[PDB]
Amino acid sequence: QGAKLFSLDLAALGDFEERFKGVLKEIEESKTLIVLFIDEIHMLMAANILKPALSRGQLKVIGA
Amino acid sequence: EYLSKYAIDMTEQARQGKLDPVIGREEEIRSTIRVLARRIKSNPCLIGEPGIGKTAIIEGVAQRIIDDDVPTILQGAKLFSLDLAALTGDFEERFKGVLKEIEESKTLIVLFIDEIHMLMGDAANILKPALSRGQLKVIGATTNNEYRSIVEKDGAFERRFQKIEVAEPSVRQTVAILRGLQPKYEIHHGVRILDSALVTAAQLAKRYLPYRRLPDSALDLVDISCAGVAVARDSSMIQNVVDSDTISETAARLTGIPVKKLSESENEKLIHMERDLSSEVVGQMDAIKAVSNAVRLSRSGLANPRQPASFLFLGLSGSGKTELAKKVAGFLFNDEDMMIRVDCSELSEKYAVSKLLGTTYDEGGFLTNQLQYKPYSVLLFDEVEKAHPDVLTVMLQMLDDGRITSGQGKTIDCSNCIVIMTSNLGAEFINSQQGSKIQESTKNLVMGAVRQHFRPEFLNRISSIVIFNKLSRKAIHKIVDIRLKEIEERFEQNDKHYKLNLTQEAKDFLAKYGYSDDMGARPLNRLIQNEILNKLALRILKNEIKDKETVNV
Ligand SMILES: Nc1ncnc2c1ncn2[C@@H]1O[C@H](COP(=O)(O)OP(=O)(O)NP(=O)(O)O)[C@@H](O)[C@H]1O
């Protein structure tokens, strides 16, 4: 319930990606108050995508 | 006539006896004297930590001067002490003509300049030609830092100069030089000092004081303490003074728990620390012993005075491992800030700043700066081998000695600090411990695994390395029940006044569901909020279920 939809359509455009990593706190700010959905981009990211926030045990995401 | 202007002879004050007697330095002095006696490179210098008693030597110098402990050649010489400042015309001139005066003045003194030794922009040669005169006996010093930058550029600076170690005592002799205090410094503010109030301030300020210097930091608090014992006494019969009051009390100023400062120092702490760990985490009796059992070894000087306390931990974050030291530190250093974070994700090359560096904003780094900030510390290493060859090599000094040069090249003691490695190197082998191996074989499997990423020096200098292995629900529910304990003791105490209920649901859920095998109850740790704290507070926050009430799912 308390979660809502976020879906990151990745536009990456110094590392310009860590933004995508910094937001992992911004949702962690909300404290799983949303969900993430990524569509066909699932690949090695920087480095690997995602998890350290999910791998923190947290972070419901809609994978695809 | 500019003689006395910023140049104030303190051999005056030494002839006046204004200056402050201390012990032993003749060693540096006689040399630094003998240095001052050198045609070739005249100028003795102390290179390193400020506040280490530089002109205190000059005192002794001036003392040896006025005592005629000043040796033959230079007995004529004395020291005008410069006062480094002026008003802008500009400054240099005033600071120059003197230079002429004094060598002209025929060596009745020498000059000491302390840490302020200038790379000027308009550098040109400031005092340097005067210094360069083949004449003009002077005394400079600085920390290593400027000594790094400025004096190494020429290096015929040394052709004038001589470096000498800024003399930092032993504690015992610091204690001893402050043991000479007890008959004398008992009565400064008009009391007596016990053997109790005597050595500990050191032992404390050593162990407990972040900043100041061995006799300095030690001698500091006791008069900082006298707010009570000097003023409230004559404001009643206290003659002798005691450690705690003088110290631990006045030590508890910063934090507290003088009992842990006092009633137990390291002695019992260890003695039961095993279960004390087990208190925080049941399970992993291995490291419950080992690291503990080990780090017990860490102290007492079984081995190198210079020597770190070092471990890799293995398991699933949210196994309590990353915590674990925070107990230990809280258990030992009575803090969780002792724990300090080294992200091996972050590590490639450029980190050499982020610890600390000789600054070229590229400025003071952090991590070493943090122990430099936090002289008692615990160092956590975030999936170690994920770091580059960058740190692991500097980790040698960490592997070494329990002491660390900052990136400006300033050593700080980790033999009083902790360093702890994280890695997944047995993750699959955690999965082997999920099959619950003879841990040896799988630790061997790990050992080989961990063996790979590192030169043995890395591998060898570790105090040891331990797995935090498969965690039976035994621990879980306990840990959970411990996990239970943390929030309730935050709140019913003050906030929530809260009496509690537990369905076995949650009791089972949190253990069963809330705990993840792989990702742990680590999320459940957050979930414990969510399905419980978040849930039941939300249940209660209405208040219709009253304060101190409880409803579990
Ligand atoms: N076996 C355990 N004993 C005690 N606390 C545990 C245990 N397993 C997980 N925890 C909790 O999980 C955290 C500690 O997990 P730990 O194994 O130290 O790795 P961690 O890095 O701290 N988890 P995290 O820091 O979010 O990655 C703390 O919140 C503990 O309360």
Swiss-Prot record, chain A:
The modification Phosphoserine is found at residue 55. Induction: By heat stress dependent on the heat shock transcription factor HSF1 and the general stress transcription factors MSN2 and MSN4. Expressed at a higher level in respiring cells than in fermenting cells. Expressed in stationary phase cells and spores (at protein level). It is found in: Cytoplasm; Nucleus. Disulfide bonds: none annotated. Changing residue 64 to T: Reduces ATP hydrolysis by 98%. Homohexamer, forming a ring with a central pore. The hexamer is stabilized by high protein concentrations and by ADP or ATP. Oligomerization influences ATP hydrolysis activity at NBD2. Interacts with YDJ1. Interacts (via C-terminal DDLD tetrapeptide) with CNS1, CPR7 and STI1 (via TPR repeats); under respiratory growth conditions. Has 2 AAA ATPase type nucleotide-binding domains (NBDs) per monomer, a low-affinity, high-turnover site (NBD1) and a high-affinity site (NBD2) with a 300-fold slower rate of hydrolysis. There is allosteric regulation between the 2 sites. ATP binding to NBD1 triggers binding of polypeptides and stimulates ATP hydrolysis at NBD2. Nucleotide binding to NBD2 is crucial for oligomerization. Present with 32800 molecules/cell in log phase SD medium. Belongs to the ClpA/ClpB family. Required, in concert with Hsp40 (YDJ1) and Hsp70 (SSA1) and small Hsps (HSP26), for the dissociation, resolubilization and refolding of aggregates of damaged proteins after heat or other environmental stresses. Extracts proteins from aggregates by unfolding and threading them in an ATP-dependent process through the axial channel of the protein hexamer, after which they can be refolded by components of the Hsp70/Hsp40 chaperone system. Substrate binding is ATP-dependent, and release of bound polypeptide is triggered by ATP hydrolysis. This is Heat shock protein 104. It comes from Saccharomyces cerevisiae (strain ATCC 204508 / S288c) (Baker's yeast).
UniProtKB/Swiss-Prot annotation, chain B:
Changing residue 515 to W: Site-specific fluorescent probe in an otherwise Trp-less HSP104. Fluorescence of this Trp changes in response to ATP and ADP binding at NBD2. Has no effect on ATP hydrolysis or protein stability. ATP 1 binds at residues 48-55. One of its GO terms (cellular component) is nucleus. Inhibited by micromolar concentrations of guanidinium chloride. Inhibits the ATPase activity, but does not dissociate the hexameric protein. GO terms for molecular function: ADP binding; ATP binding; ATP hydrolysis activity; identical protein binding; protein-folding chaperone binding; unfolded protein binding. Homohexamer, forming a ring with a central pore. The hexamer is stabilized by high protein concentrations and by ADP or ATP. Oligomerization influences ATP hydrolysis activity at NBD2. Interacts with YDJ1. Interacts (via C-terminal DDLD tetrapeptide) with CNS1, CPR7 and STI1 (via TPR repeats); under respiratory growth conditions. Belongs to the ClpA/ClpB family. This is Heat shock protein 104. The chain holds residues 165 to 857 of 908 of the full protein.
